[PDB]
């Protein structure tokens, strides 16, 4: 097997992720090293991102026999993509939000719930607001509410879906009336820019107000205005490693005509997509090493089980490499294990690393 | 067109709903000729209730040439079913929880409950209470409760009761009793609701001084004899009125039914049974309206539910418009939808438990909010 | 004499006892030849359980040439049955309540409970408590409790629960709660005991701070899951030991029984079932003893139970003496009677209810009174 | 019908009752007035008074077809006599203790429970002792205990069955140690004499100690020692009526050879037996007036019902005469209704009537 077909499912507002996925495949195509299989993606980008489009693209990919699909989903499509992959015995590698038991799924994105809870405990926060959206699911929100109930917190959860400039202004005025000082922001990247620009315009960009940015791309979003005017966040990928250095000095190639979004440093989702490509490449090497000839139907047949799918799924779930997100390893549930992320607090000189959070030592802070 | 094909979807633990569907369609079929058509149902009762099984069944229904589909869904299968129905212009009638956040080609028989519950909480002047909930029916109630609490500064302790056993409920109740919190709001599945009520009786939290609010439309569908004797304050919402000619006739027919042929007939129909009965009535009236509007219906189509590109039904827009343009009287009252698909101009009774039993204290309507009897 | 005729009397709601009687006699009949006789029972199961029906059945048994009679009686039929048995020298074996106040030709399988209950009350240092009782099993316990209270100056409030419905129990519990009395002693029929326990759970009196004492020998024969979860202190007396080879073998045979042929086998045997099983064992051993003593038995007689003048059986005195001179091991322990007919040298376990469940706290015996585990 | 056979069942220590029953029959034999039926009793006195003797005598009487039996029973024989009479459809007239629903039974003795409770309420007794026996049943005892529980009384119930002189002495010493001042005595007549003589010997016969004698024969027991040394009691029959005057001036005939016990004024049980004879005579007149020819088996047949027994039983239950115990009338349950009894309190001059108790006005006391 030298031309291995794989499937790719992307949704709207994922230009950078698609570019990173293409770049990872291209590097895998030009990496001789030690079977020389070349990954050809049958990528099917969908704009609507509704359940019907997900089903249509998934069945079309299944008709081509891709043995695996690298997909991205939202709250409205997770229950469709995961269900089809679990029933049709095709492994599903997704860098999107993890799903709170599951099969045939590899969630590359680490669960942000644990890190956020540890940070809140360390900062001894008792009353705060929870400006949030539902795009990534009700995983952080439920944990915050449950933790507040078990700890007697005065939390004010505020949904900011379908908000316009008037809505943000009204919300800001209400917060000023309540004199809320501590904020937790959990929204999509574009919504983060909208919230941050509205806050800096209305006049709450000072260091007295504490803002926790609940995402893994803290350095991926520009916060230059806040230095002039206490902001904490989580960073997933370390920029001081040899492998990310190789990615950067290969990323400087500004072929924006063929690689849109390459003008800026890759976002955390882009790093996760690159890491997923490495996981698929490494596990294909493992299957080839085990001398398992992977080969082969249509959707809505009754289930069309894949005999080789179970062993292939297990091989994915037992991979352990050193990727952009560190020790990439999965447990038997498909989640991420043995991972760490740095905690950056903004200072006068810029972002500064205070500590890092991992699943075995919780949060550990640098002290003298 | 004497025969009309109607799709039907049923999930697990919905036996009573299926019998109500069969009973409603039988009454319409065996009815005096109010001058004219028959409904043939293609029904699929899947137990797993996963998205893949729902998609397979919906494709089978689409291949079977159904004009409308009566489906049940949970948080798992809500998105796939609604999106598939809207994409192919095949309308759906559901008694499940609403999917607020815009929609098309879907008619929610179940009315919104957030307004009534919020009105009740404002009337009771509650500040701190334990909100026990699950995520089987979405998160609309949970989001609304917390948004109201944040705007009003309520210290609401929300606890999810998913995947808890009897020991877990006992430990949770003991911890809450140690925290000295008296007010509770329960919004769970009917099976989980029975389990929590049994655990409350076992612990001994059904005495005077404890207030429980049951957030569903089946307050009279459950047993509270232990709570009646204990004397704890219980408030609930009942949608089905038992003092109307229509419910009386249906109950008379309900008691005279074969238990083996109609499982669940040994007990009074629940609010979901009334809701699904109303849904069949809505479909019948809309087909009459299509006949009156001189709009002929035909499938014209095959079963390529995944035809590329999509081939939406040409008469779906008119069918959806007619479905939303029907005002009828049923077990739940004035069944009348707006242009969105939700229920509007609906009324529900509010029952407070006393020693004599469940006595209505007032009603709630979309216009006057909560009006209590004084 | 291969065949031995034995009389049997059963009152209403004693199905389990009858099956235990049949099971015990079947095991003796189908047993290895421990070197020799069979027991044929003449059984009468009257439902009214009045004195006239008992007299008719006893005359039929006497006309049927039975040497011993296994009878059940209540306060209504205790005097007629005991007097008839003593007058004609036809001995009786009973598991019912004792008839203290002298007796002859009667063997009480059920041991006296007043000693154990009085010892428990003295240990608990109780002063004021509510004694709920009925009069189905005589008045010996009631008289003893009040005599002890008078000699010790206890303010015992005794209430009879005869001919009360569920509303009556609820009203009585509410009145007692208003009077602020926490300690209760329940001595009722097993059916009435279940009803009172259910009412206690419904009212909500099964929480910490309430102490209940159940005065019977079937503490493990009833369900207290609600009381286990509530945490109220419950003390009871268990006569049957479940950690002996004999009870283990009998339980193994009990589970492998036909439910239709042996009603009540779906549940573990109650203390009365163990008592009646022991009674059949006592009769078997005594017949062996008569065979060993070279005392031939024969009815010699007709059925003129009302023969004037009375014609008592000539071998009745020796039979009664041999019955009282037998020490055996059975489900209730060392079954051994004195010259009066009551049980002596008997032990019963004392169980206190905790979160883990019913855990034995000590035992009670006729010699050392109450000995608790420390 | 001129020679009507009836049955008579008497127990040990009932010589006076048997004499009164014989005297009443004799007067009925010599009372022409206005069918001239003469009552012939097949009396079967039993000494053992156990259940076997009761059954034997009852069956022998049934063999003679007596249509009714005038019986006396104790705690050990009530459940046998009543059961046979209810099942065999023969009316049972008994002057013994009433039974707390029943059929074919006429209890001539009024229920003493109501009068005792009313007297205790009037005297405002809170703590007392209850020297009692079980011969007449647990009817008064249960009521006293239940009333005490509902009123919070400090009652000390003391059984005095099988007590010898040492037992009474020990009981008296214990009472002195407890310093109990108020006594309620409910025992058989012979036990009353034993208790009273022991009390007067030990030295508690003074007026300071209050003794309530729970019986209907207060004047039938000599209390002369207490006048020299507060004793209340109930009297059922009034000695100041024309009919009791006739009974007295006929009772002075001292034919003790044929009428034992006639040397003393009749006891309350004797008056009840005399009244029962009148009830049977009056109801036979009613049956004869209704032109119902009463006629007719063996016991232990299966039930041998008597068709005329039901109407005869109802006629007994609807009789209303003026006898020694006043307005003799029975309800549909066989108990006594529309009856009254005087309450006598001992004074220096002797017994004095304070008031009277009836079932409609409870207790009413004479005051100026």
From Swiss-Prot, chains B, C:
Palmitoylated. Depalmitoylated upon L-glutamate stimulation. Glycans are attached at residues 29, 33, 233, 345. Detected in cerebellum. The keyword Ribosomal protein does not apply. The keyword NADP does not apply. Keywords: Cell membrane, Cell projection, Disulfide bond, Glycoprotein, Ion channel, Ion transport, Ligand-gated ion channel, Lipoprotein, Membrane, Palmitate, Phosphoprotein, Postsynaptic cell membrane, Receptor, Signal, Synapse, Transmembrane, Transmembrane helix, Transport. Disulfide bonds join 59-305. Residues 1-374 are extracellular. It is found in: Cell membrane; Postsynaptic cell membrane; Cell projection, Dendrite. Its main location: membrane. One of its GO terms (cellular component) is ionotropic glutamate receptor complex. GO terms for molecular function: AMPA glutamate receptor activity; glutamate-gated receptor activity; identical protein binding; ligand-gated monoatomic ion channel activity involved in regulation of presynaptic membrane potential; transmitter-gated monoatomic ion channel activity involved in regulation of postsynaptic membrane potential. One of its GO terms (biological process) is response to fungicide. The M4 transmembrane segment mediates tetramerization and is required for cell surface expression. The postsynaptic actions of L-glutamate are mediated by a variety of receptors that are named according to their selective agonists. This receptor binds AMPA (quisqualate) > L-glutamate > kainate. Belongs to the glutamate-gated ion channel (TC 1.A.10.1) family. GRIA4 subfamily. Homotetramer or heterotetramer of pore-forming glutamate receptor subunits. Tetramers may be formed by the dimerization of dimers. Interacts with EPB41L1 via its C-terminus. Isoform 3 interacts with PICK1. Found in a complex with GRIA1, GRIA2, GRIA3, CNIH2, CNIH3, CACNG2, CACNG3, CACNG4, CACNG5, CACNG7 and CACNG8. Interacts with CACNG5 and PRKCG. Found in a complex with GRIA1, GRIA2, GRIA3, DLG4, CACNG8 and CNIH2. This is Glutamate receptor 4. It comes from Rattus norvegicus. The gene is Gria4.
């Amino acid at each position: 097997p030298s031309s291995v077909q794989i499937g790719g499912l992307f949704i709207r507002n994922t230009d950078q992720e698609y570019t990173a996925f293409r770049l990872a495949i291209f590097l895998h195509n030009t990496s001789p090293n030690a079977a020389p299989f070349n990954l050809v993606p049958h990528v099917d980008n969908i704009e609507t991102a509704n359940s019907f489009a997900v089903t249509n693209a998934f069945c079309s990919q299944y008709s081509r026999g891709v043995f695996a699909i690298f997909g991205l989903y939202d709250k409205r499509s997770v229950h469709t993509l995961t269900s089809f992959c679990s029933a049709l015995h095709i492994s599903l590698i997704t860098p999107s939000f993890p799903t709170e038991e599951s099969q045939f799924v590899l969630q590359l994105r680490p669960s942000l719930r644990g890190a956020l809870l540890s940070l809140l405990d360390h900062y001894e926060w008792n009353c705060f607001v929870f400006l949030y959206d539902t795009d990534r699911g009700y995983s952080i929100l439920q944990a915050i509410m449950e933790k507040a109930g078990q700890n007697g917190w005065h939390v004010s959860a505020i949904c900011v879906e379908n908000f316009n400039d008037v809505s943000y202004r009204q919300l800001l005025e209400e917060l000023d009336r309540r004199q809320e000082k501590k904020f937790v922001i959990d929204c999509e990247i574009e919504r983060l820019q909208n919230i941050l620009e509205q806050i800096v315009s209305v006049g709450k960009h000072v260091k007295g107000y504490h803002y926790i940015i609940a995402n893994l791309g803290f350095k991926d979003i520009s916060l230059e205005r806040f230095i002039h005017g206490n902001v904490t966040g989580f960073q997933l990928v370390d920029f001081n490693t040899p492998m990310v250095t190789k990615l950067m000095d290969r990323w400087k190639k500004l072929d924006q005509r063929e690689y849109p979004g390459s003008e800026t440093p890759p976002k955390y989702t882009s790093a996760l997509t690159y890491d997923g490509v490495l996981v698929m490449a490494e596990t294909f090497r493992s299957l080839r090493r085990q001398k398992i000839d992977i080969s082969r139907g249509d959707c809505l047949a009754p289930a069309a089980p894949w005999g080789q799918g179970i062993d292939m799924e297990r091989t994915l779930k037992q991979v352990r490499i050193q990727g952009l997100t560190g020790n990439v390893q999965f447990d038997h549930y498909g989640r991420r294990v043995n991972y760490t992320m740095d905690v950056f607090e903004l200072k006068s000189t810029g972002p500064r690393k205070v500590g890092y959070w991992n699943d075995m030592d919780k949060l550990v802070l640098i002290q003298d």
